[PDB]
């Protein structure tokens, strides 16, 4: 109304992530006022738009460090508060006890020995929000409580998730004493793990495809003893199939563009577009990354972590054998009214056997046949082409998956010091998690279903923590919380994993059922979950998509593509080929398997089964520690220092699950006052 009042103007547009934008009233004259929004754009209101303009609370005009104190507790209130603080280089903001971090794309001088000392021994709220303040109260809490702690950093690919973990080590090494080698050793394992576990997606050129757990070990007097790196949830389907505009793990491309010709001769390697595994997304070269100095960065980091040159050569041979096996081409035959195969002649088969150090006839009769061993006899059975292109792709993912464990163990052989407290277990730890976030792309597939399934467990972990803390805020004030409803997102979990005839098992069942396809699986899913409020069946019988109502919203997955990624068929002949190999390295990574040589009759777990096992391990590790949550937000799609995209940020706020915190606050007593406030009224 008045020519100097802030208002909540709502420019109604056809946008899915549109929220009211703050604006200041200026040049109030005639019948039509003028406003300038937070983006410095001018608009005319007209007398016929009076409901659009709504007064803005005085708390929302000056900004507040803790958003739970906002007068206007909504998505618009959160978005503007972040926006007006990002322009002031304030990239850290609280929502209760959750640190929202926004990628600055800029070197901000807020990480100094004077800042780490300024933030020592001070609780949340005493100091302005910072990444150290999360670590500050995380360190002090385990000493007073004798309990393990954990930090969960999550967001999209590129919102400083790995940087926030590096910077949470900068304080933590200094607060105890010398930075020590462990601070420098942990930072050398990042370029190694970001080669075997990162890849280029359609949203970022360096996307983490697993969950990294840096478990930091402490001792009495509070000093660093060691550290463990635990990898969880690796997308092993990427090794053999990539989507359009996406590429395989960085290691393959880096090795090829950074290896000498002589060496590349011994490995029978050439270019990188001559490999089906590497070239499938048509993204051999990615802008912003050069794969020649990236190779040198990995090699230098490997030397520091005590990788001998012999160990580097054996790793490259395994990687080369992965690329050669992907070039093998199968042709369907008919033995006698039975499906059969015949691997077409190619120089890759000769090289792959040489690099694997097995007899060429023993590898030929290990991808086209299967041996059934029973009491008293053994029988050989041919494999169909669809079955032949499932053992080759499972042996490739079996080498890469077991290799990735080998690098992790070799790194842990230099930074993890066994408990010197052999006498008694008196060690507390601080865990850090670099986990991915909810993703809703244009076309979703098997990998996105697993990624979103993992976040359902993580978002339930968040909700149960937010529920608890708000209950103790009520009882120090003696406020009885028995009229407030505390619902958990078990319905989504009880449809995907935690119930008979769930979504995952029906995907597993159709992978083994006779004459099973993606269309048959879709009918199976509909026939069981059509009367469920969280399942959206396709409208016609020609559509090949189904929808699941997650916490973030409804996401549609494409049926065409499943049952091929969800197959990891390691037969008993594969574990017997490795055991007979002259290569002592491939037998070292298969050490556990070759021990139980005759116990592989049990069918190999599928990738959905292996993913669920790791998720159970992760939820058990996190459930034993008090959690701290960090929310990472990227403000731009062009990596600009001072560009804040509103529609980009609103999507990440909804997908982070942080908006749940507001919902309970509205459900309870949203407005809290002190007795001094009673002066008014």
């Amino acid at each position: 109304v008045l020519p100097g009042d802030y208002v909540w103007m709502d420019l109604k547009s056809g946008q899915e992530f549109d929220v009211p934008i703050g604006a200041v009233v200026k040049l109030c004259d005639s019948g039509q006022i003028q406003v300038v929004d937070d983006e410095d754009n001018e608009h005319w209101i007209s007398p016929q738009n009076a409901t659009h303009i709504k007064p803005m609370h005085p708390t929302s005009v000056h900004g507040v460090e803790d958003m739970i104190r906002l007068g206007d507790l909504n998505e618009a209130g959160i978005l503007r508060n972040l926006l007006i603080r990002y322009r002031d280089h304030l990239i850290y903001t609280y929502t209760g006890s959750i640190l929202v971090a926004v990628n600055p794309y800029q070197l901000l001088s807020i990480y100094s020995p004077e800042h780490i000392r300024q933030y020592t021994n001070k609780k949340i709220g005493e100091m302005p929000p910072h990444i150290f303040a999360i670590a500050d109260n995380c360190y002090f809490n385990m000493k007073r409580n004798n309990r393990d702690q954990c930090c969960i950093i999550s967001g999209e690919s590129g919102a400083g998730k790995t940087e926030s973990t590096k910077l949470i080590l900068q304080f933590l090494a200094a607060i105890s004493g010398q930075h020590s080698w462990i601070e420098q050793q942990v930072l050398e394992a990042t370029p190694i793990l970001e080669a075997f576990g990162n890849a280029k997606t359609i949203r970022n050129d360096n996307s983490s495809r697993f969950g990294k757990y840096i478990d930091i070990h402490f001792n009495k007097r509070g000093a660093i003893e060691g550290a463990k790196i635990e990898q969880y949830l690796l997308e092993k389907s990427r090794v053999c199939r990539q989507a359009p505009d996406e590429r395989n793990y960085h290691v393959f491309y880096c090795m090829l563009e950074g290896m000498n010709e002589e060496e590349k001769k011994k490995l029978g390697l050439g270019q990188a577009a001559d490999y089906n595994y590497l070239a499938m997304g048509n993204c051999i070269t990615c802008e912003g990354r050069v794969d020649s100095q990236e190779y040198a960065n990995i090699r230098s980091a490997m030397k520091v972590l005590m990788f001998t040159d012999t160990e580097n050569w054996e790793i490259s041979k395994l990687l080369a054998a992965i690329l050669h096996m992907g070039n093998l081409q199968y042709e369907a035959r008919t033995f006698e009214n039975l499906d059969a195969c015949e691997v077409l002649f190619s120089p890759s088969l000769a090289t792959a056997a040489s690099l694997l150090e097995v007899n060429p006839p023993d590898l030929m009769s290990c991808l086209t046949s299967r041996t059934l061993i029973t009491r008293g006899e053994t029988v050989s059975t041919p494999l169909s082409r669809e079955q032949a292109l499932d053992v080759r792709d499972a042996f490739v993912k079996g080498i890469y998956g077991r290799l990735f464990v080998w690098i992790v163990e070799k790194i842990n052989a230099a930074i993890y010091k066994p408990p010197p407290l052999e006498v008694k277990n008196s060690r507390r730890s601080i865990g850090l998690l670099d986990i991915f976030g909810f993703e809703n792309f244009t076309v979703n597939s098997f990998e996105q279903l697993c990624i979103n399934f993992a976040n359902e467990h993580l978002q339930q972990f968040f909700v149960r923590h937010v529920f608890k803390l708000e209950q103790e805020e009520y009882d120090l004030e003696s406020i009885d919380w028995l009229h407030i409803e505390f619902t958990d997102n078990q319905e989504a979990l009880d449809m995907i994993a935690n119930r008979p005839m769930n979504v995952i098992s029906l995907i597993d069942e159709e992978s083994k059922f006779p004459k099973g396809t993606d269309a048959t699986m879709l009918h199976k899913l509909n026939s069981q979950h059509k009367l469920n409020a969280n399942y959206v069946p396709p409208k016609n019988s020609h559509e090949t998509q189904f929808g699941i109502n997650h916490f973030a919203g409804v996401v549609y997955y494409e049926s065409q593509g499943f049952l091929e990624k969800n197959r990891d068929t390691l037969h008993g002949d594969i574990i017997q080929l490795v055991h007979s190999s002259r290569n002592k390295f491939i037998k070292q990574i298969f050490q556990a398997d070759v021990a139980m040589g005759a116990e592989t009759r049990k069918r190999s777990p599928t990738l959905s089964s292996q993913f669920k096992r790791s998720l159970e391990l992760l939820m058990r590790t996190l459930g034993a520690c008090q959690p701290f949550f960090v929310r990472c937000i990227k403000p731009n799609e062009f990596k600009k220092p001072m560009l804040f995209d509103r529609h980009l940020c609103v999507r990440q706020l909804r997908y982070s699950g942080m908006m749940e915190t507001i919902r309970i606050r509205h459900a309870g007593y949203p407005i809290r006052y002190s007795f001094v406030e009673f002066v008014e009224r």
Partner: protein, 371 residues
């Protein structure tokens, strides 16, 4: 926990765990008892021997089969083989694992009820189920449509299935298998001067059959060839050092599967029974059933049986259909493989027979819940 699969046939017991590739335990379904005088005091005394231990100490025992032609005739001795399978071969407690059993289609109704009652009262299984073997032979073959010929050791049944639907009126059940074949071989081996009589020598004759018997493409030309020359004769060494020679007896014994009148039966051969079962189904099913003849069972392991089956069915069928005989190399374990596949399915977990249901209804719940 993990479910057990027990394909207790007339001749062999194939047992294991659901979700595996092959049966862990494959042992004969025999119970042996001493028939002589034990003279040495202090020797370990055992009133009964079950499985391979009865085949090892076989010259001092009497061997008996508790199952004949698919029907369990001696329940006290069959209860010993189940105990042996559960505790000695699989080494597992039966009260913590669901058990899947198999049975032939046209089998008396009380056999299945007594299996249910024994499972729920003697072994105290939490759940169980009884399935048709020919249905599991399609699960093992990876098909949802086909006519299956399952010839084991007691019976030979054909079951036509189309798109997961079985036509129960076209199911046929012949009582002629590898034990009638063994008896016929015992009888016709007496023409060359070899007399095999005892229950311990019947197992020698069975091994002779399994190692030297095949199926002739043309019986009347193979007989003439055997009469003319000695190229068909083979030798076999008895467990004492004696060698026996057999000529046309190598293909005269499997021939009774195609000419059941050799043992005095009036029924038709396995080639004509399959055609009669196909021609009893709907006309729109026959083209897809001709090209999907799945052969299962250990009796279908003779060399040349698939070729002769294809020849005979091609002669019986119109000269426009594509007659295909599917005989996988592992067809001796296809019933067990299909049973494991069925027991590993998530949809099947709602189709067990729980002990609450058995305690409420009785042993008659199996007729209402199984097939």
């Amino acid at each position: 926990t993990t479910a057990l699969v027990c394909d207790n046939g007339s001749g062999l017991v194939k047992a294991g765990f659901a979700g595996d590739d092959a049966p862990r335990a494959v042992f004969p379904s025999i119970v042996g008892r001493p028939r002589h005088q034990g003279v040495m005091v202090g020797m370990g005394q055992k009133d009964s021997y079950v499985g391979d231990e009865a085949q090892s100490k076989r010259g001092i025992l009497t061997l008996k089969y508790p199952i004949e032609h698919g029907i369990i005739t001696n329940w006290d001795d069959m209860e010993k083989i189940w105990h042996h399978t559960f505790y000695n071969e699989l080494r597992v407690a039966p009260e913590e694992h669901p058990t899947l059993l198999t049975e032939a289609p046209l089998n008396p109704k009380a056999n299945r009820e007594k299996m249910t009652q024994i499972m729920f009262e003697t072994f105290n299984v939490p759940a169980m189920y009884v399935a048709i073997q020919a249905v599991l032979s399609l699960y093992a073959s990876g098909r949802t449509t086909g006519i299956v010929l399952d010839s084991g050791d007691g019976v030979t049944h054909n079951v036509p299935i189309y798109e997961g639907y079985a036509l129960p009126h076209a199911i046929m059940r012949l009582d002629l298998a590898g034990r009638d074949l063994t008896d016929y071989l015992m009888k016709i081996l007496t023409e060359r001067g070899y007399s095999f009589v005892t229950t311990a020598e019947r197992e020698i004759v069975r091994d002779i059959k399994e190692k030297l018997c095949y199926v002739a493409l043309d019986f009347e030309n193979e007989m003439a060839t055997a009469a003319s020359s000695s190229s068909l004769e083979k030798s076999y060494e008895l467990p004492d050092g004696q060698v026996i020679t057999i000529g046309n007896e190598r293909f005269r014994c499997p021939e009774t599967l195609f000419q059941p009148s050799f043992i005095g039966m009036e029924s038709a051969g396995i080639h004509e029974t399959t055609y009669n079962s196909i021609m009893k189904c709907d006309i729109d099913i026959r083209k897809d059933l001709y090209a999907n003849n799945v052969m299962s069972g250990g009796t279908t392991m003779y060399p040349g049986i698939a070729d002769r089956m294809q020849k005979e069915i091609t002669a019986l069928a119109p000269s426009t259909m594509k007659i295909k005989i599917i005989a996988p190399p592992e067809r001796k374990y296809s019933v067990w493989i299909g049973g494991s596949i069925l027991a590993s399915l998530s949809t099947f977990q709602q189709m067990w027979i729980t002990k609450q249901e058995y305690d409420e209804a009785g042993p008659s719940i199996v007729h209402r819940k199984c097939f």
